[PDB]
């Protein structure tokens, strides 16, 4: 009610949207009678403003059927939509188109013939390529239910769009072909779609050609497994070795979608060789695109000649994409290669796959190893344990020393997950100096997470090991001539005492803390006081009275206020 018809003319400000496109409430109060012969006409030729108002309007009108009267008057909605379906702005048209399809199911079959179809034809025939690219998306939805003769006319108007003066509309049409062929009858896919397909399949512009591939997937699935060779296959086979990488990039990328869509056997004959070439493409981002689909491509090879083709055909190629000159190609493989284990068995994974699995692991490229470290999912269950250690030493050592702070973060971050899969045995001498050269790390969040490392390792390794290996070296920091490192000793203690029991905190840890309370640098000293308070609730009734209390007391008499304060409060937090 209130603010309404007056608010629809403002100054085209996004303050007049909050309530404008709330038209679901306006037309509910305007009544069905008025809404139709008043609101709709208004909304047809009064407002055409910004790409944000119109895009809200296009959306709205696709929800106006039960509000303009019902399915009987849906046709009244067409004009304000057929209008919007013409705005230069792509995102408005697409919504108009999206909303025209929704309401096109609300028409009776008769109303489609009377109204919808004429609309389509005025768009399709228009001078504005904008009008025309909107038409392409509307054939599929009014086709199945219109008359036998109307269908016939609709295929012309499409055929026409397929051969447009403007590349924008051929692209449009290409991209809508597979959708449209799906509601056609076979008689016409074979006769009328295929030629149209054939002609975008091979087109000056590769922007058009590039889009033939997904129609190729779409048309294949329609055609019986015995026509593909005559109709789909020469195009597909040509698209694969196409002049332009943009096109070949498509086939590689939609390859596994192309394999099932084409059938078990045709895969064996045409696809497997055509897939070897993509893996050997001169353009790199094609080789990668095919590397990403290698592992799927093998899981869908018929359940018998798997062992065969994977061994005889795929594997030789894989052996090269490992030795590839490009980081994106290798890193693609490193993140799939080892899913070949379930299908090759166990004898062959040791025979051929491990030479491969351990080649990537020797790679100097950081991103490569990470992925190979990250995938111990289906290779953890099949292959050995001590095997990994051969090149997992340099692997885990170089990664932790990578010039990129945020790679180092990763293995640090990984370390707690490498306990439930490598245990007390693997973690040894030449690896803990690693887990602690991180505490002296210049970057900050690495020191943060490398301390988080010891608390996560403790919570996974009881309180036994700590006293033996770690703590001896954590305290071997309280001696560093650089005060920032002495400090690390305390922060490093402050988190272990959490999960260490009363024992080890009082015995090997405490005598160190008190001993640092004499640091010539003030910063350390107040961190002593702060550190005693985190380790408060853990100690004994008489340990706190004997050795902890008499230290804070001498700390209070400090020529550096900071020390007395954090130490004043320590005394108050623990009596």
């Amino acid at each position: 009610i209130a603010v309404l018809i007056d608010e629809l003319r403002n100054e085209d400000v996004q303050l007049r949207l909050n309530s404008i496109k709330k038209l679901s409430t306006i037309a509910l109060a305007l009544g069905v009678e008025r809404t139709r012969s008043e609101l709709l006409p208004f909304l047809t030729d009064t407002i055409y403003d910004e790409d944000e108002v119109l895009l809200a309007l296009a959306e709205q009108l696709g929800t106006f059927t039960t509000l303009v009267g019902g399915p009987e008057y849906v046709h009244c909605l067409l004009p304000p939509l057929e209008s919007l379906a013409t705005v230069e702005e792509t995102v408005v048209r697409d919504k108009a188109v999206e909303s025209l399809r929704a309401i096109s199911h609300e028409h009776s079959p008769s109303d489609l013939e009377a109204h919808f179809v004429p609309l389509v034809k005025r768009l399709a025939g228009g001078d504005w390529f904008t009008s025309r690219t909107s038409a392409c998306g509307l054939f599929s939805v009014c086709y199945p239910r219109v008359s036998s003769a109307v269908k016939a006319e609709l295929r012309q108007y499409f055929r026409n769009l397929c051969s447009d003066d403007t590349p924008m509309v051929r692209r449009a049409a290409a991209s809508k072909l597979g959708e449209f062929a799906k509601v056609l009858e076979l008689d016409n896919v074979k006769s009328e779609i295929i030629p149209m397909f054939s002609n975008l399949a091979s087109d000056e512009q590769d922007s058009v050609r590039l889009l033939a591939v997904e129609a190729c997937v779409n048309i294949a699935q329609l055609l019986p497994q015995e026509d593909l060779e005559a109709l789909v296959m020469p195009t597909l086979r040509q698209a694969a070795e196409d002049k332009s990488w943009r096109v070949r990039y498509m086939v590689a990328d939609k390859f596994t979608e192309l394999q099932k869509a084409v059938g078990p056997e045709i895969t064996k004959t045409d696809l497997v060789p055509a897939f070897q070439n993509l893996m050997k493409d001169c353009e790199a981002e094609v080789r990668a695109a095919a590397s990403h689909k290698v592992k799927e491509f093998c899981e869908n090879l018929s359940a018998d000649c798997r062992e065969n083709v994977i061994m005889t055909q795929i594997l030789p190629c894989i052996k090269e994409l490992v030795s590839d000159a490009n980081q994106h190609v290798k890193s693609a493989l490193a993140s799939v290669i080892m899913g070949l284990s379930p299908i090759l068995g166990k004898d062959n994974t040791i025979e051929h796959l491990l030479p491969l699995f351990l080649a990537q692991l020797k790679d100097e490229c950081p991103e490569v190893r990470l992925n190979i470290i990250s995938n111990l999912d289906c290779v953890n269950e099949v292959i050995g344990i001590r095997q990994l250690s051969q090149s997992l030493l340099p692997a885990i050592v170089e990664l932790a020393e990578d010039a990129k702070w945020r790679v180092r973060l990763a293995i640090i971050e990984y370390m707690p997950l490498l306990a439930g899969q490598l245990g007390v045995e693997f973690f040894d001498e030449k690896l803990n100096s690693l887990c602690m050269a991180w505490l002296v790390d210049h970057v900050y969040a690495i020191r943060e997470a490398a301390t988080s490392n010891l608390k996560k390792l403790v919570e996974k390794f009881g309180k036994e090991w700590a006293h033996a290996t770690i703590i001896p070296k954590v305290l071997a920091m309280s001696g560093d001539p650089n005060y920032l490192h002495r400090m690390t000793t305390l922060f490093c203690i402050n988190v272990l005492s959490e999960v260490c029991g009363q024992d080890i905190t009082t015995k090997h840890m405490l005598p160190t803390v008190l001993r640092m309370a004499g640091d010539p640098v003030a910063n350390v000293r107040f961190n002593v006081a702060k550190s005693l308070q985190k380790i408060g609730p853990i100690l004994d009734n008489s340990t706190l009275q004997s050795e902890v209390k008499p230290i804070l007391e001498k700390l209070t008499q400090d020529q550096d206020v900071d020390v007395k304060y954090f130490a004043q409060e320590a005394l108050t937090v623990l009596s």
Binding site: E88, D127, W128, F129, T130, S163, D164, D165, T166, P167, M168, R171, E204, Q205, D206, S207, V208, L210, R246
Partner: protein, 163 residues
């Protein structure tokens, strides 16, 4: 440009120039590829020699309409940019979600477009407009530092049109 010839002609004229069929819309290529076929005529098979003509003359005029300004000029202009003309002025910026306190041909033409599209209910296309967006639209081209070089290789050869 879509309005210059139709598909049937479009391809024919491109064949009679021995020009990669993909290059319709590139006026300066087409021009010079025709000034190169004419060097193979006179006392020079010959039925093509006057066909390339009939086609090419029809396109020269269609293109002359494409270059007519809106409203007949009622309601920076010499010849070919040349010298140190400034086609872009920062790579991503002038092109992407622009930062616009400049007048580089890219930013000028872009202003020209969003100024004309105010009174044109019509959608604009290549050789009506000449802005990057219209170009990148016509050929099938991806927003990249290659595509800019291609565009401003045709602009460097077009005579100050729409300024």
């Amino acid at each position: 440009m879509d309005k210059v010839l139709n598909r049937e002609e479009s391809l024919q004229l491109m064949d009679l120039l021995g020009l990669e069929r993909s290059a319709w819309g590139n006026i300066p290529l087409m021009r010079k590829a025709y000034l190169k076929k004419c060097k193979e005529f006179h006392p020079d098979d010959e039925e093509k020699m006057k066909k390339m003509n009939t086609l090419y003359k029809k396109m020269e005029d269609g293109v002359k309409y494409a270059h007519q300004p809106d409203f007949g000029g009622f309601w920076a202009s010499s010849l070919n940019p040349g010298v140190d003309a400034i086609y872009c002025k920062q790579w991503p910026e002038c092109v992407k979600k622009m930062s616009t306190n400049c007048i580089c041909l890219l930013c000028l033409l872009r202003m020209k477009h969003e100024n004309r599209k105010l009174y044109r209910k019509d959608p604009l296309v290549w050789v009506d407009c000449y802005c990057f967006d219209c170009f990148r639209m016509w050929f099938g081209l991806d927003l990249c530092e290659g595509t800019l070089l291609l565009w401003c290789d045709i602009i460097g050869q077009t005579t100050y049109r729409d300024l």
